Amino acid sequence: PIELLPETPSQTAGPYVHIGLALEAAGNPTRDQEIWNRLAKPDAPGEHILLLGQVYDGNGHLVRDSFLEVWQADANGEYQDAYNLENAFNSFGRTATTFDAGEWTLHTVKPGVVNNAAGVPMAPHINISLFARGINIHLHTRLYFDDEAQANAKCPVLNLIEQPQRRETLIAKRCEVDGKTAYRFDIRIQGEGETVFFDF
Amino acid sequence: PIELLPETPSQTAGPYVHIGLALEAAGNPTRDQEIWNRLAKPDAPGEHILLLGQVYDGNGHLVRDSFLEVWQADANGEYQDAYNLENAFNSFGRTATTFDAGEWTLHTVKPGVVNNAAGVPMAPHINISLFARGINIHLHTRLYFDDEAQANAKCPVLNLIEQPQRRETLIAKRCEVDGKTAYRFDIRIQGEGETVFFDF
Amino acid sequence: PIELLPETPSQTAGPYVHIGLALEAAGNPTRDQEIWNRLAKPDAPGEHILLLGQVYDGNGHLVRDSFLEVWQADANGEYQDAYNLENAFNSFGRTATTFDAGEWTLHTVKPGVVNNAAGVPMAPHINISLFARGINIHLHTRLYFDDEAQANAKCPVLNLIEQPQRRETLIAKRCEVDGKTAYRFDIRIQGEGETVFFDF
Amino acid sequence: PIELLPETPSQTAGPYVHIGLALEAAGNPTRDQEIWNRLAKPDAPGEHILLLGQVYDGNGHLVRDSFLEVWQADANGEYQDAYNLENAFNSFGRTATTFDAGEWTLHTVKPGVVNNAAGVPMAPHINISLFARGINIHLHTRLYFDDEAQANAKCPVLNLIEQPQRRETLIAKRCEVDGKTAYRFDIRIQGEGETVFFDF
Amino acid sequence: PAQDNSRFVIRDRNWHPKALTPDYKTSIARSPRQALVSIPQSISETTGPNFSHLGFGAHDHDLLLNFNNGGLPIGERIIVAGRVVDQYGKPVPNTLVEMWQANAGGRYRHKNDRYLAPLDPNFGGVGRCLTDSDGYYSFRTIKPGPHPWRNGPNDWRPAHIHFGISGPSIATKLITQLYFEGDPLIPMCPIVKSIANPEAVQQLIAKLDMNNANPMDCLAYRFDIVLRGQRKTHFENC
Amino acid sequence: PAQDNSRFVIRDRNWHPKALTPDYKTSIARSPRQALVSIPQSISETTGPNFSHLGFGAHDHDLLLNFNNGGLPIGERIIVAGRVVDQYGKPVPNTLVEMWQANAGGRYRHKNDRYLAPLDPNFGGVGRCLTDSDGYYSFRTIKPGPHPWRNGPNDWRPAHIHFGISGPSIATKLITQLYFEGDPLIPMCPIVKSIANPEAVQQLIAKLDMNNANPMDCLAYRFDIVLRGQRKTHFENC
Amino acid sequence: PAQDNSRFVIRDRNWHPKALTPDYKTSIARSPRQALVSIPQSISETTGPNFSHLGFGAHDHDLLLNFNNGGLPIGERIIVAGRVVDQYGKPVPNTLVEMWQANAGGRYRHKNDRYLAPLDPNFGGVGRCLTDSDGYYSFRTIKPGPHPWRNGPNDWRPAHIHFGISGPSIATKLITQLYFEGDPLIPMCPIVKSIANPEAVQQLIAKLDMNNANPMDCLAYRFDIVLRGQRKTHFENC
Ligand SMILES: [Cl-]
Ligand SMILES: [Cl-]
Ligand SMILES: [Cl-]
Ligand SMILES: [Fe+3]
Ligand SMILES: [Fe+3]
Ligand SMILES: [Fe+3]
């Protein structure tokens, strides 16, 4: 058969990933421009939301060295690839869990609906890639919203998860943090309540 | 050493096993004669019973595409191997769970006692072979009866299971379905309460 | 793919074939029973006919060392495989061309119609296998009759010959020899008027 | 020596070539635009002519499944390579014999004179490529015109054919079809009067 | 009735696929985590149904005719034939061989197959027969097409026919899959690769069998099946 | 109009099949017995039609949709794609690629094919396209079935698609056949074996191309085509 | 805004390291036990950030100058350079390449690294750049020392540089590690050996590149990166 050049194989990001990819989180000096966890400036259109979460291993213990990358549509359901710190909104961001701060946070807007390749609407979601010591190739997941139950029930991606119980692992829980709308999205890498991870 | 011709290797029956082996359930027309789940005509000697069960994966979820083959002695402890739809009793039958509720049923009689090769009586049992998508080589088990405690306790096959707690997984529970004598035999393929499976 | 034992390869019969297979034609002493050119005794049912012919090479020159075997139905269209010199009719015979007698002869009856494997009638025919010095594997042909034009035109075997002109090579010519019905069937191995040869 | 990538090897077009390249003839519906046998619209400059011919195998039998491609200069000696069904003249066309039509036809104009690479005029000609069942790589030839005898005698391509008798095989015969100017160009693939075929 | 009068050679469960073969994703949660418990052979295991008295329809072995809704199925006409023997080379006569498969486009006639390739109105996909007195079986069918499936993101089954064979006892009963000589999908399939030993994989590949073809009609493939060796009992209880 | 400004590398007629290959029976009477006459390249041979202005229908390259009589054709959905280059490796853009084939059962939609395998009412078997600006072409189709034929008494074509490619001149024009990776019929076919060199035969075998497949939809095969090398003229007439 | 116009060749997850590789002890509790769920590519997966307008400082790619506290860092001065391409061989221009590493003694400038080898006051160990219009990147740095770590009782990372590459989409984003030609620690490392295929491990080994060295100044290593092949969509939703 036709065999292309093989892709470069993945390796773990390791425990010191934050020195390369999360300088402030590493408590190291930052450069003038960093890619970080504020996707939306106050004047971005849409519903401003705080996202937060903790990451657990197979023994139920906190993962305090995780590095997360996120990719989401703007409130209008459009992906904005022109990354610029001057933008009111960027579709891409980074966050981390650390020894000092075991709970990651993101400051964003709720994403609008995006159609799949067949034209079928997907429920509002944030794409997440999870990296850490012990993780040899990053884990892909999606964060959906518990106040989008009708859309979630019809999402062609959620519906590829055979068991309804596992779909529940991708639904972030609405709350309030200091008076502002927030969602908690915890990830369980292994075992009871294991978060669904995707291949694509 | 002496090496015989290798046996043809097993493969999974796959999710469409019903096309070939459970035609009704595939949604398909049947042929004039089918091998199915009614082992006994109403005139067959012995105690007429219903067997039913559900099959669970390692996540506690129903296996809704299982296919089961059974082999049991008649009420007089004789294996009736000359398969014939006109027989009062067939020692062989087939059943399947299907989507819906995931429950299989068999209509039979309670088997009589048969001796092992050393002449020691075995407790009444039904031999079961379980096939499905995800199962690469079929799983062998036995269904014993909870109202045969004395015989069960002395069975030379059950006594080969090292742990009494595991012996309990093979004991079907007497119950009533539409007022008629039945025994429920659930199978747990993996994990908590995992059903004992045999090699022979 | 599946490869069976290979067939033993053919070789030419060579110039002295008659010493083994045509003893009288070789002018050598015969045994008590020989397989020869009289398929029908006078008592055989059917139309008694004399067949005769000459064999030519690619230069138009007579082949004076040919050996022919023939296989045909009786007048009722049945093949008679039980070869016996006591029979009024045998379906099999042998003839030859020699230095002294360059024209072979056969004494037989006109064969009845035989159906092909699909049940379609074949025109009356004699199957011929031709052997000689220079012929590495024998040549198969059929002798049909010029007074069976209607049947010939419908024969499913003749109709597998793409060109009508080549079909004519298989049609023997009715004549009279010493007052009796005869057909001449000349064979041209190569070149102008080349006789159709079959593979089966 | 310097060895380039090998050319993809030829294979016969086979007997069903018309399915792909002569749709009308296969018995099939045509697409909106087809490449076919009318090179010239009525307004095209030059002398409008019909070309026709039959193709013979080595046994003198018609090749009924021939497919022919032609390439010729327009009346002004110009090769029109921008193929378009709207053109007054296309230098390229296709035709075929078929069973229904064992004769091929082309509607064109007489080509003007073209010089060879050394600047020497070639006699008026049509370049032909012949494809069919039994032909493993197409045969190249040229059709010249019998009323161009003076030019033909000086053609540097015709003069590369060593024997004058073989040159005659490339000279089409002027005739009239339904009262209109035509030239017949029969091709004999093999044997007596074998048509000259070219390599270049 | 049946009697205990034979023993069957113990299976090599490293020749067979293991239960847990995670590249075949559904095996992860459907594989036991505890060891199988070995038990000695008794009459319960060394006997099984014989199907000599099962009534077969005229076309049960012929998938070109057994789902006839006005025409022939579309696709590559093939005979699939072979012999069932045990590990000692002894033929297994009058044994039940069942098969099922997708149509020429890789679509199954099952309510749960929603692959976009069309059903064939003249193809059902199920066959059965008994081996003859010398151990041979034969079916006539259409060569199935490869079937895409929701395992990895671009996984395709090679062309394959599912087989079940009863044999002389419940100890010999086997379900397997036939694949076809040369199919470039075979080395890529995680179901094929559930079998760790490459030599075992080769035992599932049917060979083109021109000797058994009907000219101008259908091709043929040969697929031989080997069930567990059967022997008489000896020196037991003494 | 066209001009003479290039030369084409001379063909290797021992790499191509010879005219007389008697195992392919119809070649015996359809092969010239006289030698080909070599002629130098002129404008007549070094030019040819370009098809940029030919009007193509929307589905001309898509055999799943171009004979639509109420449904999809039955059979293995496949993309057949590749690149046309010359012997120097230069892409051949905007060139005409035509193809034709049998349906999934080896039956041709031609009046002269009376093989008993049925026609598919939604399959025609004809495609065309132009290569793009980088030399690539693409068709969508059904994988054809093997085709029995009246050569030897049990001869079957391997699965194959007929191809015609125009290229830059009448000197480059080529008709050939594509075969499929692994097909056990390939080594048996007297038409394949008209090519004497085994390495040339390999050049006609399309490879399974999983990288180009549409998951849950269609597989893909890759078939690259090499036309005669084209060079500028040099040092002529001096 | 970004558009869905491309597809990416599916990953070979037996070429990459698997999740559960127990000799790398931390992977035991940080590997999912359920199968990944395959999903089709949509605009969510086939797009990603373009960093063309991220503002880079003058020395972001030069670790000899980007942590300047009064001197040059101690250790082997090297250029690390290479090309980012996709599996079709197409360069990946204007893509973000980030890297981090220990100093010459195997010590990281992170609070959690308490290895006894000293920090270098003029080394920070972090770099970033974009590939140029032809897919090439380059850093200047110190060759890192092996790093002991609490896996097995005497485990040492080979000298290595961590790499992150964005590529055209979130589907191509990759984190990996570079190793150095000839390092005898490579075959011994359980993180290297998380990769099952020895040929894949070889793809992570940077080669000494004397051609790219500055004489009397610095040596050079070459490390090329291959991201998932990108192709146009074809024959979707039809
Ligand atoms: Cl035998
Ligand atoms: Cl290129
Ligand atoms: Cl380049
Ligand atoms: Fe299947
Ligand atoms: Fe063909
Ligand atoms: Fe490190």
Curated annotation (Swiss-Prot), chains A, B, C, D:
InterPro entries membership: Intradiol_dOase_C, Intradiol_dOase_core, Intradiol_RC_Dioxygenase, Protocat_dOase_a
GO molecular function term, any single one: protocatechuate 3,4-dioxygenase activity
Catalytic activity: 3,4-dihydroxybenzoate + O2 = 3-carboxy-cis,cis-muconate + 2 H(+)
GO biological process: beta-ketoadipate pathway
Cofactor: Fe(3+)
Positions of 3,4-dihydroxybenzoate binding: R133
Cofactor note: Binds Fe(3+) ion per subunit.
EC numbers: 1.13.11.3
Keyword vocabulary terms for this entry: Aromatic hydrocarbons catabolism, Dioxygenase, Iron, Oxidoreductase
Pathway: Aromatic compound metabolism; beta-ketoadipate pathway; 3-carboxy-cis,cis-muconate from 3,4-dihydroxybenzoate: step 1/1
Similarity comment: Belongs to the intradiol ring-cleavage dioxygenase family.
Role according to the record: Plays an essential role in the utilization of numerous aromatic and hydroaromatic compounds via the beta-ketoadipate pathway.
The protein's name in its UniProt record: Protocatechuate 3,4-dioxygenase alpha chain
Organism field: Pseudomonas putida (Arthrobacter siderocapsulatus)
Swiss-Prot record, chains E, F, G:
Chemical reaction(s) catalysed: 3,4-dihydroxybenzoate + O2 = 3-carboxy-cis,cis-muconate + 2 H(+)
Enzyme type, top EC level: oxidoreductase
Cofactor: Fe(3+)
Keyword Transport (UniProt): no
Residues given in the record as Fe cation binding sites: Y108, H147, H160, H162
BP GO annotations: 3,4-dihydroxybenzoate catabolic process; beta-ketoadipate pathway
Family: Belongs to the intradiol ring-cleavage dioxygenase family.
Protein name per Swiss-Prot or TrEMBL: Protocatechuate 3,4-dioxygenase beta chain
Organism expressing this protein natively: Pseudomonas putida
